[PDB]
Symmetry: D3
Subunit: 289 residues, 6 copies
């Protein structure tokens, strides 16, 4: 919960190995920019030039540690950013400093952007007194999910149980191939041999209702209109009481009030990751000394 | 250059290693959802719900190929997409189709989204009467460059070693630095004197960063009059809105950051439609 | 649950990568024995010389497929093996068959041995009238996790709330790090508001009660003797019906009925993976000219 | 032979990549446990709750060194383990200690179980006055051979010719493929212009003699009963005194004295790796911060 | 051209990953040789027993650093070696020292044998008055590109290339280069292999920066390029194929700008090095 | 022996991984060259422009089999090549065929040059009435070791003595680390309970006689002039043991006959892999129907 203790969430080995691949991706051969740089001791200042939330310090750190550079932060992880802010200093050999600059900035930029979009969107949820949770989707970038998931958590959103946990989602496609929703749900509880929580993706009011009577614990109301969403939700908590309702599909920071309803527990926003602009950063080398 | 023959731009072996990496990332553990759906033959339709350019077919196929699934495309690669269009059909064992579903869609969503974004950058520069080429930057998602650069290519967007303004500060002076790269270029700048100096001891290109449109053409003018051999690039704060203001009589390339940093993904989905 | 339908659980790409690394581990140099054997087409019989459950056909297949060989099974995945049974036939070039013999047999032997031990434990507990569930532990051979999980499943063992990823496991060591159970459970609940499955591992009746009071959804009773376990479960279910009681530590196939009890939900057995002797299989050719 | 220089056998870079992959397998995603425990400096005690031999210090060390943790040993590698013995201390940040607990414990359990089984068998053949040597087999767990070979050696089992120097192993499948042992052994020697060591697996006294008259250097007497094993080895040693006699198949620690004999050189026991119970070890924190 | 800052060309993380697979390749199983030697602190001397250019220091250092050993270099990267020269000292446990020997000596041998041959050819072409660059090719050992590309660089050697087979597969020397600029967008340069002047003027017409004239004989090669550098001035012309240390003067000419030789990587003897333990603890 | 069936020695999964890494190294980024050629069914012919021995078909095939192309060979593996020779043709999509050109040619060139140099050295030493064997060494290119060791075998040099000869090598760096050849040879023997051959590497006549007195089976005479080698070798007969003599050190084709002597049993030439010029091959497209 506390934004700063969350650095402890990232597993050191797979994070080291994930930063290793990125470094390899970007310089596959001889680095001629080093020959201009020299290997003289140097320093750079990291300027944040965008409003938002700051997230991604552990990835930033690990990248420069791999190049045996050191980094000193003046804002914590989760600080509000007010443009043109000194956030950090980086020290090490010039050529290693400039090797790690792209990857590092690029990583911080998008991580912060997704924390920033997430923060905005939870401030919109409390704005309309809504007392459910804002969540992300699995609509992440192949190869980059550790970073994006961390951003959502920093900016206050939540990883869906999809990998924050494990709930056996049934998508319509599951429903289609299983032969209807009832079949797919006992096949969903066939496997897990305990009080499981099963969730169904539902595109229409009829689908939602069959799913609940089939005994699902969450109903996902996908790509509904606010007009038809709340009537659908109200019935399904007159159906069963423990059935949570989740809303995804076409939800944006502006029109999110329209989805915050008396009768929705969760809102998943695909744009937290698919549409979030990257925060603007730059690493300007200050002195050589 | 064919709207649809650039799928050949990808080396097959590196593609399968990239795909394989993505798939093991997604489902390390056992796949219980496979039991829900079973292994019966199946088909799904790829639907495009956004406007834009289509991009990333080769990654899409390599995913499903690695899973023993075949793919029929109904549009060329790089064709335009007007919403709720049927883009393709994917066939194979139900559980293998669902296994590839999100890596494929998330991949195709971001590739198209960048290509879409490039296309708008070149169409506004084409329409605002300007010669040259619109390029991307290196502001890419780590571990995802191959996808993102292919996406620029398909969208119509645009050597030696580049020298940003930190190699200059590190090597001491622009005059000493240009040398330093040539001893074995796009020098960066924040002033006019620095852009004139940039071409010395033999330099070949320039890149102006975070300049107002009004302040750049008097810089730009004096370079065809310095040594006409060097091109001039504009960079920084170029967006879809403010694109014509940065096009100039003496601006050869315009590389923007927001075609990859601020380019929303396109809405796709994949529905199964008949199952036996 | 349907035993041939269990093959569907192995993710194909990581199954292929796993098989590939085994073969590389086993023959990285020059294969001189191929000179003795030639490449002529051949056929071999798989013989089961041990009693138990057959488990591991998907690994066996994959191994021989990367060697361009073909397997026909006579028993389905999950069968009871009655010693000296002709279980399968393997067709391909002589040298490719012998190249896969060792990794294939060692894989099949170790998986089946785990399924044989699990099936015997599921039925020992069945036989005593216990409606709880036998599960396996996380005490697995590093690198062989996927095979060993699959073996448990073919034999009837269960899968835990973990792996599914919807459970924070606070062990004794976490308690001590956190200052005690009450603080430990609260930090665990604050990992994220919404995935409230906290299991607390406990070594005394008092420790279980505090965990139950602090809001623990499961209680792992560790290394209790049967005459300590049963009273402890009985009072916990008397005062905390919604908490689930899982017992582990010290359980064998011999004493397992002693550990069944009407208030034990899950018995997880380390021996299933840590002392499950491997079954005996062999693979012989029967024509080559 | 002396068990503490045995650690010198492990190649550092291969060992590190092995430990690196095991860790990645065990925690590929976010580590919510860490927030419960924090990152304060801690100390855990390694307890040995089972009788046997203690093998695996190099793997246990490498696991924790990659998590920037330290180990102090109180017992040398190889030393006998008397139940409930305090065998090591591990110092580090709390969450890093618990990140390594499971893999380190599971690795040490297996390696020690195998060394324990080897040592019990080595000693049973020494009390019985046998001049021969007990060995393991290639019947290891895939991807884990490095630990299991090491376990065998610390327990006192011997190396084969596939370990030191070369060997062509003509298994009974190779006899059938070449069509005859004379044809199989002479194909084997064709693998080099220099003197080879060729071992033929034999299932009967007939095949043993045919193997020896064929120029076999070693003879693996697979699965004889002791009534046939001793006349066979007595014949071989008399009339082919240069031939080495190895026995394997169906050997147990109980019947091992029946397979000893003055003309058996080596006894490869498969159970040493497929029916060797892991030792029970635990890692308990004993203060934090 | 820098002299000893060329160590900085090599990207550190790619380097340790590469050295890593070299060590896992050489030592898959158990290390029985360590029981002979032990782990006592010790010290070894690197000997150069061959004349030539010394190249490969970053690889040598990387290999032994991975084994927790230390290296002291007595000669800078790029020196000429005259034999029996004492070039370095390596420090660390006895078993870790010998663990790195075979992959350390092999890498150095190849790297410095290829720098040697680059120097020998750079000199020979210099002795013929020729003022253009001597480059290597891509006929490298597979998996070893980085080490060989660095070797040539230490030795003094040096866009999209349309080989003869892209002329055939496109269907004309002419259409290949314009389908080459097609999606290249002015971003990359175009070089084209040719076996006659017909072909050469075609590719220069169509705006190809460089012409490579493959397997011409020196009579034929020199009037070719004179004629060619005239019609289109800015087209740099390269000759290659069948070029050796000895016949290199016959391939140097007023109008050749680059000479690629495949001997420089496919026929570059390794240098003789050795690593002997001394004055032990 | 039979060079045609030594393809059997190559393990298929290791071959495939090796070939993948080379393909990865050769095409790191986009292949714009592929746009010029296209993906139409075409074919090329493989031209041996150089004389020698043909070796390396399995790596050639494997490369093009990874790329979805097929190879028909007109000469068997191991055949003396006469230049102006058409050796094979290859069919596939154009861009794929040209994607495999470079790596296939470089590999076949280097393998065949190593084999050609080995065949030369074997024939030359037969021509001098010498009956020892020519062998290669482990001076092999890292990452390429398999191809070089194979080529050696194809051309008739032993590359596998330390894989198959029951042989263990005691370098003179061991002798020094162990302090005297007396204990180097004793430690080398300690590791095995079976008799093994020990080869000691000597730089002088003193070192040689001490190694034979120590019990060495082979003595490697390293870097002797021919002038000092053969007196040294004749003298060791003083031992008269089945003590073999091996010569090594700068033995090239141009000086090999001077090292052939009646008291030299093995000659190992590092230049067969360090200084073996590569054969000239080209792969030219002809028709595109």
């Amino acid at each position: 919960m506390d934004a700063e203790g969350l650095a402890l969430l990232l597993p050191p080995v797979t994070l080291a190995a994930l930063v290793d691949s990125w470094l390899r991706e970007d310089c596959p051969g001889l680095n001629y920019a080093a020959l201009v740089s020299g290997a003289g001791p140097s320093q750079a200042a990291l300027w944040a030039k965008s409003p938002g939330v700051l997230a991604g310090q552990p990835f930033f750190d690990a990248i420069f540690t791999q190049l045996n550079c050191q980094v000193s932060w003046f804002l914590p992880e989760g600080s509000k950013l007010v443009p043109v802010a000194r956030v950090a200093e980086v020290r090490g050999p010039a050529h290693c400093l400039l090797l790690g600059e792209r990857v590092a900035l690029n990583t911080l930029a998008r991580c912060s952007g997704i924390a920033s979009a997430a923060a905005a969107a939870v401030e919109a949820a409390r704005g309309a007194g809504w007392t459910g949770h804002v969540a992300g989707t699995r609509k992440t970038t192949p190869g980059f999910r550790l970073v994006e998931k961390y951003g959502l958590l920093v900016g206050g959103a939540a990883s869906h149980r999809y990998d924050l946990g494990g709930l056996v989602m049934v998508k319509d496609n599951h429903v289609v191939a299983a032969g209807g929703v009832e079949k797919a749900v006992r096949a969903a509880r066939q496997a897990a041999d305990f009080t499981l929580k099963v969730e169904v993706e539902c595109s229409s009011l009829q689908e939602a209702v069959q799913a609940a009577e089939a005994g699902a614990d969450l109903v996902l109301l996908d790509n509904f209109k606010p007009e038809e969403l709340h009537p659908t939700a109200t019935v399904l908590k007159a159906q069963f009481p423990s059935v949570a309702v989740e809303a995804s599909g076409g939800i944006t920071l502006d029109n999110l009030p329209q989805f915050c309803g008396p009768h929705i527990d969760v809102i998943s926003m695909g744009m937290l990751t698919q549409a979030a602009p990257a925060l603007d950063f730059s690493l300007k080398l200050f002195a050589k000394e």
